[PDB]
Structures are given as structure tokens and as C-alpha cells.
């Protein structure tokens, strides 16, 4: 009993054949039932033929007879068509207004979220309709992830590797940390508690969360939670107040946030402001300087993942009084120096999956780009705060979309905060890239960033680019290029000092074999934010929409402060990037 999706008219009808079973008004529900294949409707009682042994599920074939709903041949002489006047029989009959344009929500309800146009629809349709787009999108792919095989261990070779069998009939999920498994110990009674691991090929190398010893026959699954419909839209309407209301300014300021103070002057005067968050310019410095500017306020340090809120926790250890801090994670290993589960404190450091229902002064949401409409709306469902602060940047990284197959989703339509960030522009940014040299910062300014990023110190003359062609070999969910592992083969010879230039890679298995040949550390391009190294080497290895993506690879380039290696096999970025180039050995 509530309001329908498009019309928001009070109703009592819920489409049975639909994904998430939403409320629909009589005319609105009928418009859905004829404009989709969703032929099931479910009111306070089920609309099926209640005569014994019937199978009809469509509503049109149903007719009312007495105290039930009857099919063609099961009816009594006294009957009445449930589907009449273009509005199916239901409670709140007259108080239905109908929707002129329903085909959008029919498309979302019939959507499989396969192509990019599905996401374009997911973000173009209206407010609760696009929240429902997020609901249905997620709901679909958690119904997807468990439709794969179960990782049943067969043998215990040694530490860090195992043998894996998979159930017949359903395929094997990709071999990365993208699909986080979770295990339980199979016993004579039931299965209980192993923990979250991710598997790659050795032999099956297992990356376990905690230390643990496994035996034969124990199997892990890709678990899902119970996804429950949100309340609030993606973000509240904008309102520009006259002055900083509800907040008391500071007395004096330190130098390291001056370029930040003349920033917080405006996020404090209205409620929200999207922040063009270029990588590593003092982003968590931006977050902590909010509290430095306003100490008494509650600042809500959150992120889509715990490893990102750990970044804001790091600068809480040095700049924030810990007497008034809070670390919130429910019963994973993280930064747990603050008091755990303290709701009514000033600084709350937590992840969207566990932020409790509270009210606070200002929020700082790290990494608005890795998040979808869902969590970026459940944060508003969590807090109706005075000021909202949006850390992150679409030119950094999105969440990995499993069902996105054909076409890429452009910077515009990752989520709602990505909308106004390049239509009305960002309200906000920091230009002091505390990381990059002039070799990289000028290159990335002329990339997507509106020719913005000014140089920090110098042209290091340590970042290298070299053109190649490469031949590609790919088997299951990866891609390995032997010759581009054969060019790093010889360049690390004449240098005794580039031993410590960590190997970055698009696909983890290629560098997993390279580290068997070479031994340099690993790095995932998809989740590279959080740590930056002075010296890193990298190979794109691919010209398709994985590594040649402008923002997916901008992060790999932008995390080096003096020197970086980028073996380019493409034409898309060679004429677009400019480092110092060497010949081919």
C-alpha cells in the first residue's frame, strides 16, 4: 500500500512478473501490463485463477467471479472483466492519474542492462524512475553472480595455491578481486565461516583476507545481501543561501589550507557542491581542512570502499583530535584505532554499507566516481545534513560494470553527481597537484580536465614512453603479451636503480607471470587510488576499451611523481601523450 512509480498516485498494485515488484496505480499498472511482457499483477491478494489446478498468469484472461479472480472456463455466470477502461481493477481506483510517457519505465522493467544505452536510460529517466533503474540494475547482477559455479577446492598443493573444481552447468567467474568470494566450513551439520577470498590461477592461487588453512572439499560462493529499496533521491535540490548559516568561522588559519579556505568559503554558504577531485592534490587534505575550518561541526568521512575511507583516516591520525573521532565497520581488517561504533561523535569514518541512521553537520564523501546512483542516494537516506562535500572525480575511475558489454559509458552518465559536474561545471576543485611533475600534470590538463592542472615543481625527465605493436594472447578472462614482457626484459638491465619501479598492469595475471619472470610487485589499474609510488612501470598491452580508456589509464599515469614507464602500443594516446621516447631494442 503506497504510491506508484511514475504517477506517485496512492495505489495497491504490484507487478508480479516485474524485477523488484514496485507499486503501480490502476491505469499505470495496466499501461505497464500491456507495454511489457510483465503479465503478472499482485495486489493485497494474488490475481490468479483460484479454481483448482489452473495455470493462467496473465491478468487479461482473468475475470472476477464472486470472492476471487477466475479464468475463462472456470467462471460462474456472474462475472466482470478485471481489465476494463484501460485500468485494471484495484484499490484506490479513482485516485489514479496515469502517466503519459510510460515506455521509459517499460524499457527499464524489460531491460537486461547489457548495452551502454541501458545505462543512458538508467540516468535519463526521472527521479524515482532512475533510482529504480539503479535498484533493478543491482538486483539483476546479484541474481547474476550466484548463477556461476561454486569454487570447490580439490587439493592442497601448498601455501597460497590450491586446486579448484567448479560445478557442472554454470561457468567460471573472472579471475580477479572484482568478484569477492566468501567461504564457509563444510561440516557434518552445515557450512560455517571461512571468509572472503579472491582466486587467480597459479594451480589456483588464493588471496585470503585472513590467515587460514584449508582442506579438501571446502567450497566458496559469491554471496549477495538483501537489497532493500531506498527512500531518498540521488541528491537533494540545490539552494544557495545568503551566508554560512549554522556554522561559526575560525579565528586564524594555517598555510597548508589557504587555497582550501578560499574554497570552503562557498561550500559553507550553500548545501552541496561537486568537487572536481583531480587525483592526489591534497584531496583528504581538503577533507580534513573542513574540520580545521570548522572544528565543532560533525564531518562525515565516508567512501564506497573501506580502503578509501582509510585514506581520510590516515590524515585523522595527524590532524584530527582522536578524542572526538569514530571508526565504524560492523563485525574485514581496516584502520581500527578510533573507537568502534560510536554514533554521536564529530568525525565518523565509515563506509556506505555501514553508515548508521544519523544526523550530522557536513559530509565528505570520498570517491564519488566509484559509486553508482544507489549508494550516492542511500547517503542522503542516511543524512539530511547542512552541507554536502563530494570528493572524487569521474575522470578517475568508475565501479567495474559486469553487465556492460557493448559500448562504454561516457564521463557524463556514471551517476547523478557526474551530471552537473560538466554541464553546469564543478563548483569546486584544488589545482595544487602535490604529486605529479610538470611532465604529467600538463599532459593530464590537456586530456579531459579543461586545460586546468598547473605544474607543481619541474620536468623530471624521468617519465618514459615508447611505441610498440605487440601480439596478443588471451585464454579465459585475461590477456598476456609475451613480447611486451620481453621489452621490460632488457630495459631493467642497464638500470640498477629501477629495480624498485613497481609493475602496474591492466590484467593481474599477465604481471603475475611477469613477476614469475621478473619479480616486481603487482598493481590493479581498476582500484589504483589510495597509494602512489615515485617509480612505477606499466604496459597498456591492449587497444580495446580496457586500458586505452582515457580515465581508466589517467589514474595509472597520474600516480607517479618523478618517473613512470608507459609502453604505448596504440595510436589513440601516442599523438595525444608526450613524454621522452627511446628507440626499440
Amino acid at each position: 500500500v503506497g504510491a506508484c512509480v511514475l504517477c506517485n498516485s496512492q495505489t495497491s498494485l504490484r507487478c508480479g512478473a516485474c524485477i523488484r515488484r514496485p507499486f503501480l496505480c490502476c491505469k499505470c499498472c495496466y499501461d505497464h501490463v500491456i507495454s511489457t511482457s510483465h503479465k503478472l499483477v499482485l495486489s493485497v491478494n494474488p490475481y490468479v485463477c483460484n479454481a483448482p489446478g489452473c495455470d493462467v498468469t496473465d491478468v487479461t484472461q482473468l475475470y472476477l467471479g464472486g470472492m476471487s479472480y477466475y479464468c475463462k472456463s472456470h467462471k460462474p455466470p456472474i462475472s466482470f472483466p478485471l481489465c476494463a477502461n484501460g485500468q485494471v481493477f484495484g484499490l484506490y481506483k479513482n485516485t489514479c492519474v496515469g502517466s503519459d510517457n510510460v515506455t521509459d519505465f517499460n524499457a527499464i522493467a524489460t531491460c537486461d542492462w547489457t548495452n551502454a544505452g541501458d545505462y543512458i536510460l538508467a540516468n535519463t529517466c526521472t527521479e524515482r524512475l532512475k533510482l529504480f533503474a539503479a535498484e533493478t540494475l543491482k538486483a539483476t547482477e546479484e541474481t547474476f553472480k550466484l548463477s556461476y559455479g561454486i569454487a570447490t577446492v580439490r587439493e592442497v598443493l601448498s601455501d597460497r595455491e590450491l586446486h579448484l573444481s567448479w560445478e557442472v552447468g554454470k561457468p567460471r567467474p573472472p579471475l580477479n578481486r572484482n568478484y569477492v568470494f566468501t567461504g564457509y566450513r563444510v561440516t557434518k551439520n552445515s557450512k560455517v565461516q571461512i571468509g572472503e577470498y579472491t582466486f587467480e590461477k597459479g594451480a589456483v592461487v588464493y588471496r585470503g583476507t585472513t590467515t587460514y588453512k584449508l582442506n579438501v572439499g571446502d567450497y566458496f560462493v559469491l554471496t549477495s545481501h538483501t537489497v532493500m529499496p531506498l527512500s531518498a533521491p540521488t541528491l537533494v535540490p540545490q539552494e544557495h543561501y545568503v551566508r554560512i548559516t549554522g556554522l561559526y568561522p575560525t579565528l586564524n588559519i594555517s598555510d597548508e589550507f589557504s587555497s582550501n579556505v578560499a574554497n570552503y568559503q562557498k561550500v559553507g554558504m550553500q548545501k552541496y557542491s561537486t568537487l572536481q577531485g583531480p587525483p592526489g592534490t591534497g584531496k583528504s587534505h581538503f577533507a580534513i581542512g573542513l574540520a580545521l575550518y570548522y572544528p565543532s561541526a560533525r564531518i562525515v568521512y565516508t567512501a564506497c570502499s573501506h580502503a578509501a575511507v582509510d585514506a581520510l583516516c590516515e590524515k585523522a591520525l595527524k590532524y584530527l583530535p582522536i578524542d572526538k573521532c569514530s571508526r565504524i565497520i560492523p563485525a574485514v581488517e581496516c584502520f581500527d584505532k578510533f573507537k568502534v561504533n560510536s554514533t554521536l561523535e564529530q568525525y565518523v569514518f565509515c563506509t556506505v554499507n555501514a553508515l548508521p541512521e544519523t544526523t550530522a553537520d557536513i559530509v565528505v564523501f570520498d570517491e564519488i566516481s566509484m559509486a553508482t546512483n544507489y549508494d550516492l542516494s542511500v547517503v542522503n537516506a542516511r543524512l539530511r545534513a547542512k552541507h554536502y562535500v563530494y570528493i572524487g572525480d569521474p575522470a578517475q575511475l568508475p565501479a567495474p560494470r559486469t553487465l556492460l558489454t557493448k559500448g562504454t559509458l561516457e564521463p557524463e552518465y556514471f551517476n547523478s553527481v557526474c551530471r552537473l559536474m560538466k554541464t553546469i561545471g564543478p563548483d569546486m576543485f584544488l589545482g595544487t597537484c602535490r604529486r605529479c611533475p610538470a611532465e604529467i600534470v600538463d599532459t593530464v590538463s590537456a586530456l579531459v580536465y579543461d586545460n586546468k592542472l598547473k605544474a607543481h615543481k619541474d620536468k623530471s625527465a624521468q617519465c618514459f614512453k615508447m611505441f610498440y605493436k605487440g601480439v596478443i594472447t588471451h585464454d579465459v578472462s585475461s590477456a598476456i603479451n609475451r613480447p611486451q614482457i620481453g621489452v621490460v626484459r632488457e630495459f631493467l638491465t642497464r638500470n640498477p636503480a629501477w629495480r624498485k619501479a613497481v609493475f602496474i598492469s591492466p590484467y593481474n595475471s599477465q604481471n603475475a607471470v611477469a613477476s614469475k619472470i621478473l619479480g616486481l610487485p603487482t598493481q590493479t589499474v581498476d582500484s589504483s587510488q589510495g597509494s602512489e609510488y615515485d617509480y612505477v612501470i606499466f604496459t597498456q598491452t591492449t587497444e580495446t576499451a580496457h586500458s586505452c580508456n582515457v580515465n581508466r589509464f589517467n589514474v595509472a599515469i597520474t600516480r607517479a611523481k618523478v618517473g613512470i614507464l608507459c609502453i604505448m602500443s596504440d595510436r589513440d594516446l601516442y599523438d595525444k601523450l608526450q613524454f621522452t621516447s627511446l628507440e626499440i631494442p
Binding site: 500500500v1 495497491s12 491478494n45 472476477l64 464472486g66 470472492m67 466482470f80 484499490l91
Partner: protein, 186 residues
């Protein structure tokens, strides 16, 4: 029910018979309109009977399902309505013995047992701050539940007995403040 198609035919037949009886011409020509009008109330009160019962059928079914919806929405909220109703009745009750303990619990003086009613028997009342101490305990007498109790065993939260004369404003920020002040009735 007049907006039905058969009503028009019935009206035409009735007008024809009105004209016939106003003229009174024949015996059989008007009898045609007893073989064409007496039929005209056969596809009229057959079509206007079933629809009228269908109306009440729909009404009765709608009322039944509305009642079922109300019944499902009521028995799923009892543990908020019970408390609301209870507190409304309590504030309607207007008894000082109740209001005293309700206010005290609203700021913190929650007893840690059933309040005894005999002239003997023990009571323990948590006191989390000092301003709360000012109103309730004065010297040796404890005022609570509109009664007079005798203070005997003040103790801090780390299970250390704290003397009575020690309790004052300046030295108050020296104690584990959730005091448990055991007492006995008058």
C-alpha cells in the same frame, strides 16, 4: 441506470405507444407495439439487472479487500502504537508519584530494580551527573517516587565506595559519575 443502449429503444417504443393511445386508431396496429414494446423491456431489464448487481459485487469485494489491507497494516505496527497510547494515558493520569519518576528517568535517574513499597527494603538509583544530584539527594535524605529514603552507600562506576561529604561541585569532575546510590524507604 439510463445511459444504456436499450433505454433508447425502450423510449422510442414508449413514445410510439403514447402516440397510439393518444390517437386510439386500430386494435392490431397498436398490438404490434405489444409484440415490439413488451419485448423492449426484455432486453432492457435483462441488461439493466445484471449490471446493477455487478456494481454491488464490485463494492462488496472492494470493501472486503480494504478491510484486509487495514488488518494487515494494523497488526504490523503494534509495538509503536502501544507505547504511544500508554504515554498518552499516563500524561492523562496526572499523579505526582508517577510524574516524578517519569521526569527523573527522562533525565537519567533510572532505578536498577523494582521500586520497593515496604517501609524496609532496598533501592538503587543511577545518577549520571551532578545537577541531577542537586534536586534529588540533600544531605542524608533521598527524594524519589514522592517518598523519603535514607542515603547509605554512594559508590562510583569503578566499584569504589565514595563518601558522601566528598560530593561537591569542584571535586565532582574527580569521580566515575554513574553513581549507584543505594537507599532505604522511610
Amino acid at each position: 441506470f439510463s445511459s444504456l443502449p436499450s433505454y433508447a429503444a425502450f423510449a422510442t417504443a414508449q413514445e410510439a405507444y403514447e402516440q397510439a393511445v393518444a390517437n386510439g386508431d386500430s386494435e392490431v396496429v397498436l398490438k404490434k407495439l405489444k409484440k415490439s414494446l413488451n419485448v423492449a423491456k426484455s432486453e432492457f431489464d435483462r441488461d439493466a439487472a445484471m449490471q446493477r448487481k455487478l456494481e454491488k459485487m464490485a463494492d462488496q469485494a472492494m470493501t472486503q479487500m480494504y478491510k484486509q489491507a487495514r488488518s494487515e497494516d494494523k497488526r504490523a505496527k503494534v509495538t509503536s502504537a502501544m507505547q504511544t497510547m500508554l504515554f498518552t494515558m499516563l500524561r492523562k493520569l496526572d499523579n505526582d508519584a508517577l510524574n516524578n519518576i517519569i521526569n527523573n528517568a527522562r533525565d537519567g535517574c533510572v532505578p536498577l530494580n523494582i521500586i520497593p513499597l515496604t517501609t524496609a527494603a532496598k533501592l538503587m538509583v543511577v545518577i549520571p551527573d551532578y545537577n541531577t544530584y542537586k534536586n534529588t539527594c540533600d544531605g542524608t535524605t533521598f527524594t524519589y517516587a514522592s517518598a523519603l529514603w535514607e542515603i547509605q552507600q554512594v559508590v562510583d562506576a569503578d566499584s569504589k565506595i565514595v563518601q558522601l561529604s566528598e560530593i561537591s561541585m569542584d571535586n565532582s569532575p574527580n569521580l566515575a559519575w554513574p553513581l549507584i546510590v543505594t537507599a532505604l524507604r522511610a
